[PDB]
Amino acid sequence: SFPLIFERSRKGRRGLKLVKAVPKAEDLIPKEHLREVPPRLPEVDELTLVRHYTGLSRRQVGVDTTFYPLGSCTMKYNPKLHEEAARLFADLHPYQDPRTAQGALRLMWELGEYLKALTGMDAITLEPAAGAHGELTGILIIRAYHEDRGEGRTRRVVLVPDSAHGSNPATASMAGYQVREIPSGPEGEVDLEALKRELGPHVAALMLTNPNTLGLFERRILEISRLCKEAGVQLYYDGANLNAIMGWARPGDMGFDVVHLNLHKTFTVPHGGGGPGSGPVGVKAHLAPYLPVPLVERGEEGFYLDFDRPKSIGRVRSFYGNFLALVRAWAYIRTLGLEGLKKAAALAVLNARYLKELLKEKGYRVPYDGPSMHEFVAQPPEGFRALDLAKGLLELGFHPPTVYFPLIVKEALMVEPTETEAKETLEAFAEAMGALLKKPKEWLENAPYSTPVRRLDELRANKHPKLTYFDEG
Amino acid sequence: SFPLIFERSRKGRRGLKLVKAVPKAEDLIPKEHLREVPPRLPEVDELTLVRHYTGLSRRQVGVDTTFYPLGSCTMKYNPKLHEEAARLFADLHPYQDPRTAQGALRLMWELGEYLKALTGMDAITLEPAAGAHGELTGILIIRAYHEDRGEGRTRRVVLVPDSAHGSNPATASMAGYQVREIPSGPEGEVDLEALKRELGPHVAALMLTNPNTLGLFERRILEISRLCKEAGVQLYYDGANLNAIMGWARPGDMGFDVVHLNLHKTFTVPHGGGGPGSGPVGVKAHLAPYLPVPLVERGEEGFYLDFDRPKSIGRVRSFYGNFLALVRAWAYIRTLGLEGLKKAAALAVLNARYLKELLKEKGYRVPYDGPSMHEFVAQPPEGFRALDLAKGLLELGFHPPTVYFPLIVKEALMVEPTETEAKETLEAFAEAMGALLKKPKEWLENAPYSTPVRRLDELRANKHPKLTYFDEG
Amino acid sequence: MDYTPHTEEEIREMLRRVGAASLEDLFAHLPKEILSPPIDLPEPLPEWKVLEELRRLAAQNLPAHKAFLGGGVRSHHVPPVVQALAARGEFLTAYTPYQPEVSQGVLQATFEYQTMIAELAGLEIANASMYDGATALAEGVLLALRETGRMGVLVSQGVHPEYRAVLRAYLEAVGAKLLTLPLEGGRTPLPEVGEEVGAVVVQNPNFLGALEDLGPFAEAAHGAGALFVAVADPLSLGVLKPPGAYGADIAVGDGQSLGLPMGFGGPHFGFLATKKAFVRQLPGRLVSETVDVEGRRGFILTLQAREQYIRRAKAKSNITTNAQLTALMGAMYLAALGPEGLREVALKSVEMAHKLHALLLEVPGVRPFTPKPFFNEFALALPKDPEAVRRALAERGFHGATPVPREYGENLALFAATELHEEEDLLALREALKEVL
Amino acid sequence: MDYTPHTEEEIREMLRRVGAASLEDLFAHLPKEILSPPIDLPEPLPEWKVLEELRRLAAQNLPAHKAFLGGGVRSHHVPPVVQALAARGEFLTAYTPYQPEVSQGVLQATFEYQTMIAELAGLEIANASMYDGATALAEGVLLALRETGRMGVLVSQGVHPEYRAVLRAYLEAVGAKLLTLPLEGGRTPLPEVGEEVGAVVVQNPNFLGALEDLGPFAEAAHGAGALFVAVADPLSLGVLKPPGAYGADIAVGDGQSLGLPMGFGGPHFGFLATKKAFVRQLPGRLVSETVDVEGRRGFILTLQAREQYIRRAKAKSNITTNAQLTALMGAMYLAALGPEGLREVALKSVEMAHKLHALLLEVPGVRPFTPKPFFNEFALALPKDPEAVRRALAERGFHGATPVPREYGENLALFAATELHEEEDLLALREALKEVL
Numbered sequence A, B: 001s002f003p004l005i006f007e008r009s010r011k012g013r014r015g016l017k018l019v020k021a022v023p024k025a026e027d028l029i030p031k032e033h034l035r036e037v038p039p040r041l042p043e044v045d046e047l048t049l050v051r052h053y054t055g056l057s058r059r060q061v062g063v064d065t066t067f068y069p070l071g072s073c074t075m076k077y078n079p080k081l082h083e084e085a086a087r088l089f090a091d092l093h094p095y096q097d098p099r100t101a102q103g104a105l106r107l108m109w110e111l112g113e114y115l116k117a118l119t120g121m122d123a124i125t126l127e128p129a130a131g132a133h134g135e136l137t138g139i140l141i142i143r144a145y146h147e148d149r150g151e152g153r154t155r156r157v158v159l160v161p162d163s164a165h166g167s168n169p170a171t172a173s174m175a176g177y178q179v180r181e182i183p184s185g186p187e188g189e190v191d192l193e194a195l196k197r198e199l200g201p202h203v204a205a206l207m208l209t210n211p212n213t214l215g216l217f218e219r220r221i222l223e224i225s226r227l228c229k230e231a232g233v234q235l236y237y238d239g240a241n242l243n244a245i246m247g248w249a250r251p252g253d254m255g256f257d258v259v260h261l262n263l264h265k266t267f268t269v270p271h272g273g274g275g276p277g278s279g280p281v282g283v284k285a286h287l288a289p290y291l292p293v294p295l296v297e298r299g300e301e302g303f304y305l306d307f308d309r310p311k312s313i314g315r316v317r318s319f320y321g322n323f324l325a326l327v328r329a330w331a332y333i334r335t336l337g338l339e340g341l342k343k344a345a346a347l348a349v350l351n352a353r354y355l356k357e358l359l360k361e362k363g364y365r366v367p368y369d370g371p372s373m374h375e376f377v378a379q380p381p382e383g384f385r386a387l388d389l390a391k392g393l394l395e396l397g398f399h400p401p402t403v404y405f406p407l408i409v410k411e412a413l414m415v416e417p418t419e420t421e422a423k424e425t426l427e428a429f430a431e432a433m434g435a436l437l438k439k440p441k442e443w444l445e446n447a448p449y450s451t452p453v454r455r456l457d458e459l460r461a462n463k464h465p466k467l468t469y470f471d472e473g
Numbered sequence C, D: 001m002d003y004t005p006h007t008e009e010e011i012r013e014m015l016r017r018v019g020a021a022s023l024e025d026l027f028a029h030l031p032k033e034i035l036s037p038p039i040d041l042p043e044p045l046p047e048w049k050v051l052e053e054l055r056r057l058a059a060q061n062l063p064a065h066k067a068f069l070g071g072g073v074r075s076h077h078v079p080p081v082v083q084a085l086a087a088r089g090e091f092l093t094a095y096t097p098y099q100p101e102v103s104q105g106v107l108q109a110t111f112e113y114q115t116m117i118a119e120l121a122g123l124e125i126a127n128a129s130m131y132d133g134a135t136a137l138a139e140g141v142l143l144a145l146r147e148t149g150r151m152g153v154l155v156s157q158g159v160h161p162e163y164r165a166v167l168r169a170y171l172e173a174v175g176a177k178l179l180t181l182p183l184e185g186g187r188t189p190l191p192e193v194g195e196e197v198g199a200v201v202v203q204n205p206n207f208l209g210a211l212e213d214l215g216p217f218a219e220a221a222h223g224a225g226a227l228f229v230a231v232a233d234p235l236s237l238g239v240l241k242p243p244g245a246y247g248a249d250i251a252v253g254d255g256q257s258l259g260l261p262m263g264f265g266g267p268h269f270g271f272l273a274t275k276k277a278f279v280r281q282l283p284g285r286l287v288s289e290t291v292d293v294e295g296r297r298g299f300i301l302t303l304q305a306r307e308q309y310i311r312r313a314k315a316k317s318n319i320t321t322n323a324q325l326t327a328l329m330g331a332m333y334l335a336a337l338g339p340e341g342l343r344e345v346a347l348k349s350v351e352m353a354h355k356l357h358a359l360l361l362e363v364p365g366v367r368p369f370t371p372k373p374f375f376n377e378f379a380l381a382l383p384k385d386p387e388a389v390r391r392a393l394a395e396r397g398f399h400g401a402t403p404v405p406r407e408y409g410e411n412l413a414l415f416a417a418t419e420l421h422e423e424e425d426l427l428a429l430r431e432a433l434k435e436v437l
């Protein structure tokens, strides 16, 4: 049991006291503009505040406490060094004179240079706030590209594989595009024949992750690129799985026109229980003029925010980007260097393949298993549902991998251990997965048992949703 | 279950890498000085280090997570503001040019003045590392004083009440003195009659806390002072219970000649699982010349460390004192001011006096219940053991108060809530203590049950102690 | 340097176990031509050296602490207690809470965030957060258009220009149309709303800091069957009548003012509050109270058909990663201050801003622009170019005079003040301004 | 401002419950004359203003990051990962772990620290921590005198003068005698040890940074029936042969060199390591592994008869509060680097110090004093007053030349180098010294 911050409140109780002499409201703002009924915010002292949130953190797990093999998330260690690095630029105002923010602008420029170098793009925007935001940015760019060529009325559809993440097709809609989903081949890679059938003057772009969401590298990627080029279709790169190939291969050399990266995934920026993140977008020179404004350029006086871009799609969010996260990523790269990043990708791949071997030894299956990259997708043996095994893992002190995704594999167990997890950790995880199969169906169906809370009534929460403490409306 | 850092270890595994081009030993250090066998330090990666310690912290409780009514400890809230305050002075070297450390020296001076203002002392050293260290400093000061007046051979005994903290008599021994205990009267206060028969030219000092360790103010303190002064006996004030009177009464106006304060108790410096702390020692002018060196003074030039004190007892610890803790105490006083400190003392007393009433109504007894100050001492009803009630409390999600101290009360329950705890918390606590009296005897004796570990085998740890992981020797 | 735990002996064993000959061999199945890319990155550095470099860059900047710059972000006190709590590893390194049994911490905290935001705006419900204020506005408007089925939008020019720019991008992307209502005398005149208008948007306080009269805008919107969307600074809601009380259907804003570090523009967070009756169109994550098999209180993500995993193409938004950690920081701030504390901070910044305004009026050639009543920000007309003034000010050690784009008028500059500003800072700024002028 | 939660209504009720008419009425039984003391303290300030004042104070100081000052404290890298971990509320705000069932975090962490210190020292056991190096030494010698039953002590002048002063205060307090062995050629000559001597004390590296030959000292002590106490910098133990290997009976030192912020002198921690055979005489807390009622592994404080609570006047020491948190920071550092990482750090500092030694020797008038081989510190003979040089060096933005008391010689100054010092730092310093000279 744990109380709500609102239940801890006591009428009239004060917490922080930030004002010595509080002015009288009516001396500052006109009566009819004044709030009559105070918001029902909690009224607690600082000690209570600390115990509350510290108590909540203790009813929570994270990479700092548990192995998180979540495919499509790259739950790698978030170095504490980066938190210290970020506090160093906390006191900077986005509208302060640029000549006094050179350190910050320089960092933004360098980061952009490193990311382009690792991705093979010619220009880049560090403005978008997350991966999906980068997707919306890239697609809008691709759209502005076609429109600037008189095909804005014909290029109406976006193509995504049946294994694509939900945000890909969702983005198409936000960009006003129609979306068609192409099926995967028997190996789990792109079906060229089905692709060649869809390609045409009506397709604006093809969204892909490489490796794909099955953890497999698209071996015919160059061919796929060639087909797209002749049809005039823009090839979009979802960088969710960039961790698998950092420093070994670049999407740009694969033929991708536009790219988005997830700093809060591949580059150690902390997940923060949902966010915030950063979704930089890199593009080839022919799509560069459509980039959202402003761009960080290196000039004579120094670095500056460039707004003089006539074909720009405009603004995708306020200011210039989640700077403090950019600091985290800059720190990571300047720490590992090229060799460091390559080693990280190789071991990220080795941990995934090695663990794939352990789970198969335990009886788990892998429908699509060519040389697995940074992640892989397994299925439990007939008779076991992923949902239950996941809960069983929770009971055993482990955290389940991603479940029921990609959508093309029943009882999908999408596993991504990342390079920061140790050998013995992968083995302990595999052991736990093997043990759960030797547990009775009823035990699995009623797990967890020891967690702060057991399975929740998902039904009641959807039929009678109580969305706030006051449940107004 | 939880693994030892040594068990997480893996041969050859590396963690932090702070050296780019590591030189070869043979080139800097002669063969015969080089360590042959590496220390068996753990070999863990950073993620492992973080999970280990994050895990250990989750198997721990503190004021940040739990109500800690420990008598004699003043477990009051430690403002997070102070941690940020100490960070501002992390990079200062004790031997850097004082002309470049004026900010730190000014702070030391100001803190000294504030503490002398609250205690009524004329001069002060911020050097001692803890309360017990302050006692030694203060007792040596008294000895230097007696020896300087030619009574060093005759002043050989230190007097302490039967209710005194064990460090008091222990300190007398470290200082070469004999120690004699004087019993308390029927009210829990000093027995003036027993005191008069002990006072004489052979007594060097009388060590007292006020309020005493029963939480009772020594109402005859002025008479005690008069009696002491008449015999030429120095009155030492153990500041463990200063939180009960700060801003309301000063030991210096009570007749005390020397005082020691515990910044980590009364002034919010964190207890850190046992340490570190700070034990400032203040004195009346007649004892000032014997103060340990150096003292912070402000001269024509600026603030400086004064070492020119021919009668000083010397040095009691390295450098000048636990500066970083001093920053925290300075912050505390500059935040609250006199009225804030007075309010804290009053609410600390009110909390103790209120909780006392609640506990008596639940059936607990108070063998000495005159007007209770910042703490009070209770005992369970006939038939119950404090130890068992203590463990029962743990099982209930609370932390017990100090048990079995002072030594003059059987089954002592020494309770000190401090001013930062809320009325509802005091009540929930009493409600818990009450419910434990209704629990069957076999239940309490075998408590706790849900904690990370149940009752430990003290006898085993004492008969067959395993002091290190390697258990060498 | 790196964070990999693997020892050489472990890599050999793992290599042999997966049938690989070396690390390089793990990538042998990739097209020969894309391998060995010519990547140029600076040499790896130990952590203390990376910090040395960060500090050198930081040493190049002039800290904006106690700055008088405004336009959306201001130098407010960042309470260490809040930052200490948000630094807890559990909150910092957790992922989106999909396994609720082990995520009650973040789940309950988000539910509390929702409650606080809904209360602050005077509305009924709120999502788990949005990237920022601008994007929150865009999503709030898209919601109104989906709810009304219309494509027309009226936005006051009083809405921060960047917000209006972001809104336009999202709007034109889906075929919707936007009409900008220009300010008159610093405030936005009541427009006539047609039935093609699905949303009416107004910010309060507005970009120039002027308090707008929302009531009639809500009545005007409803009369035409259009939804009213209010853009409001959260800190200001601590003392100003919230949009909910004006009849607003949707409220959005950026959370930076709730004790968040300025951070040169990010990250912070956006909030979106609305009526429970529009919950089906609400984008983003939502936490609901519920119970476990033993009857214990619990919290979980709900109504997930509105999101991308389940609805994919028909999702209300593509938003996956949100801005949870910073939204929690806002919640901790709101909780730490309480209703009276928040009101105190808001009133204090308003007071200092007014004192500054009064002081600045004495500067030669300076003329007022933003009309009374204004909140904690205001625009003045300067006798010199605003960018030139900001620069000259920075040369003297001050951060002030944030340039207002010309669409509002010539030579305009914004000025703000907060609870951490004192009389002496105001005077010091004025003298600096008199020297530059 | 304050941290009190009580509302006026609660105080009102509580006051009635305890039978008091007001807050002041709670002190009515105190003598009337000591009440209402006129205490002079500055007026209260809000947290942001307090921080502002701390900032103004900090701005007055020239930070010592990367200083070349030595003499006990040095500017080493303080790893953020360690500080972040030592910042967890549970470690920060816990008290001495007397209720073991809920204190396994601190109890185990402390057990691991005892283990690491014992290992580093090449010994068998160590207590929970001492206040600091100087204090650890005093206690260490008192331990040896109790064990041998003697009253004589021989201390090398090579021991930090401050440690010797503290040692003297403690020793004279109990009637013990102390004889000082003067340094010859920067090293302490092997003394003749009488049977009245219970402890022979030597530091390695010594105050002047010179490496000392500990073997013959341990033998000279043992041959007379005395114990050998070694003072050693923990970081140095990562590469240098441990006193335990030389046959030392007791080892002590200050833990600042293990990644602890210099903090202008405190706090840090001191360590005391010795043989399991002398445990009965060991002062301070001691954690032992044990088991619980069901056989689960656990940790608890043990052999408490050595401490003040139980033994009072006959306790081994009056020590109650120790230096637990900082010692734990020390353990974290040790675990974070491991044996090799620690060895590398010690080596890099030794390397840079030597490189610096050679460079400064070129400055005209600068002559050597500390003989080879020295560690990461060394003293030089300068052509100008050391203090004057430090001041002059400081006016040029350099922290260096820590004055050596005349008891060691004239115009001597100590310099130190650490793992965060690079080639260019050494050169810039030399140039500066060249200038002041």
Ligand SMILES: Cc1ncc(COP(=O)(O)O)c(CNOCC(=O)O)c1O
Pocket: A071, A072, A073, A130, A131, A132, A133, A165, A167, A209, A213, A238, A240, A241, A262, A277, A279, C096, C309, C319, C320, C321
């Ligand atoms: C393949 C792939 N692409 C994009 C994203 C989204 O990036 P963010 O907007 O989250 O930064 C993801 C993330 N998917 O997780 C969705 C969830 O259900 O949590 C992805 O895997």
Ligand SMILES: Cc1ncc(COP(=O)(O)O)c(CNOCC(=O)O)c1O
Pocket: B071, B072, B073, B130, B131, B132, B133, B164, B165, B167, B168, B209, B213, B238, B240, B241, B262, B277, B279, D096, D309, D319, D320, D321
């Ligand atoms: C009355 C009293 N006097 C002294 C001390 C010691 O001060 P520090 O050296 O701890 O700062 C105390 C603390 N007693 O705690 C005893 C224990 O065993 O924890 C005190 O209460």
